[PDB]
Design a protein around this ligand. Structure first.
Ligand SMILES: CCn1c(-c2cccnc2[C@H](C)OC)c2c3cc(ccc31)-c1csc(n1)C[C@H](NC(=O)[C@H](C(C)C)N(C)C(C)=O)C(=O)N1CCC[C@H](N1)C(=O)OCC(C)(C)C2
Ligand SMILES: Nc1nc2c(ncn2[C@@H]2O[C@H](COP(=O)(O)OP(=O)(O)NP(=O)(O)O)[C@@H](O)[C@H]2O)c(=O)[nH]1
Ligand SMILES: [Mg+2]
Lengths: 169, 163
């Protein structure tokens, strides 16, 4: 039998939420920016030998629609919190996401993975160690990714599934 | 106050004309950018560009004539200009307001409300309203969707200044 997982992809504008999702769903990358309003996807994968149906909600980085964003967080089971490794502000934004998710879901243990994207680029401003230390303080996994090269893409989403599965048991 | 027009096309077929009153009396700098982009007189402007995001029950957004993909646009003053004022509010259908990416990032992208959008007050500069052709804007919604992608190419086939 199958298991289904409701994943929600959040993070600041332009960090690569959609590029990550499209690499997972469609196996390609383009440099063109297509700004998100809202998109949803479904994909069947095998994780840890078990068949998994992934529901992916790709949200916009825009933060001014609290009523809708709260319902994303109520419904979602796990959250991919994305920043870009060459955007320090996007890394500073991360704790706001964790705070909002804990608030809306009324829990300090929500399935969450920290994702440092665009690791292919030569313009890093956020040290891996800084992000590793922040994920440790949260007790959550940290994964560096590149939607362009596909580095870490499967790992980031599949780790999130594993965090949900662990939490549910 | 100047009046400008858009002749709206759907995959190149005429839909109809939308005309706008531009509130130069209250928002002169923002009204003048839109007027001039509508005549093309600076050598660039709205003619040929598309409405890339049409969300029924909220708004029709367009104005990216530089990247042609909803990311671009520019003003007659440079790439961006500051928020001029927030005197006018998004009070209902027909309001014409500037799109932006945060404070003081006005370029050429704009939106026409199809309902009241009061949560945008104080964040987007209102500077005009539909005069004639609200039935054309309503007809544009057939081609939108919840995430704003359009099922046909909705373009400003022609535009200019009236009266
Ligand atoms: C939470 C879902 N959700 C909703 C919403 C809320 C409640 C209920 N249901 C919905 C939709 C139907 O549920 C899928 C909205 C909405 C808006 C955004 C993202 C998600 C949204 C969003 C993304 S970027 C932006 N908003 C401002 C945008 N800026 C750019 O496009 C720039 C350009 C100019 C360079 N750009 C590309 C970047 C990145 O900044 C801009 O100026 N306007 C001009 C004003 C209307 C506005 N777009 C827009 O489209 O509102 C959509 C609207 C009104 C439905 C609100
Ligand atoms: N080099 C490189 N560019 C990337 C990477 N991920 C995304 N980009 C680029 O960064 C831009 C923004 O990506 P996008 O996925 O649209 O970001 P987003 O977070 O979904 N933006 P939004 O908040 O508007 O929905 C695009 O030009 C895209 O090609 C990456 O890993 N490496
Ligand atoms: Mg996106």
């Amino acid at each position: 039998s199958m298991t289904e997982y409701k994943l929600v992809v959040v993070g600041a504008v332009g960090v690569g939420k959609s590029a990550l999702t499209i690499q997972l769903i469609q196996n390609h990358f383009v440099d063109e920016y297509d700004p998100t309003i809202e998109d949803s996807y479904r994909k069947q994968v095998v994780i840890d030998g078990e068949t998994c149906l992934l529901d992916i909600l790709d949200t916009a980085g825009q933060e001014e629609y609290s009523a809708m964003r709260d319902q994303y967080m109520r419904t979602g089971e796990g959250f991919l919190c994305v920043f870009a490794i060459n955007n320090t502000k996007s890394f500073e934004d991360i704790h706001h996401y964790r705070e909002q998710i804990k608030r809306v879901k009324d829990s300090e243990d929500v399935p969450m993975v920290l994702v440092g994207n665009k690791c292919d680029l030569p313009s890093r401003t956020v040290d891996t160690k800084q992000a590793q230390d922040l994920a440790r303080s949260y007790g959550i996994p940290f994964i560096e990714t590149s939607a362009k090269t596909r580095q870490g893409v499967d790992d980031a989403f599949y780790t999130l599934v594993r965090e949900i599965r662990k939490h549910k048991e | 106050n100047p009046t400008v027009f858009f002749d709206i096309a759907v995959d190149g077929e005429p839909l109809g004309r939308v005309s706008f009153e531009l509130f130069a009396d209250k928002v002169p700098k923002t009204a003048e950018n839109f007027r001039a982009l509508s005549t093309g007189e600076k050598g660039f402007g709205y003619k040929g560009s598309c409405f890339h995001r049409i969300i029924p029950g909220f708004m029709c957004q367009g104005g990216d004539f530089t990247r042609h993909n909803g990311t671009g646009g520019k003003s007659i003053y440079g790439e961006k200009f500051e928020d001029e004022n927030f005197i006018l509010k998004h009070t209902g259908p027909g309001i014409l307001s500037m799109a932006n990416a945060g404070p003081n990032t006005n370029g050429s992208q704009f939106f026409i409300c199809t309902a009241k959008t009061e949560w945008l007050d104080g964040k987007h500069v209102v500077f005009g309203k539909v005069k004639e052709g609200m039935n054309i804007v309503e007809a544009m919604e057939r081609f939108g969707s919840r995430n704003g992608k359009t099922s046909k190419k909705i373009t400003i086939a022609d535009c200019g200044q009236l009266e």
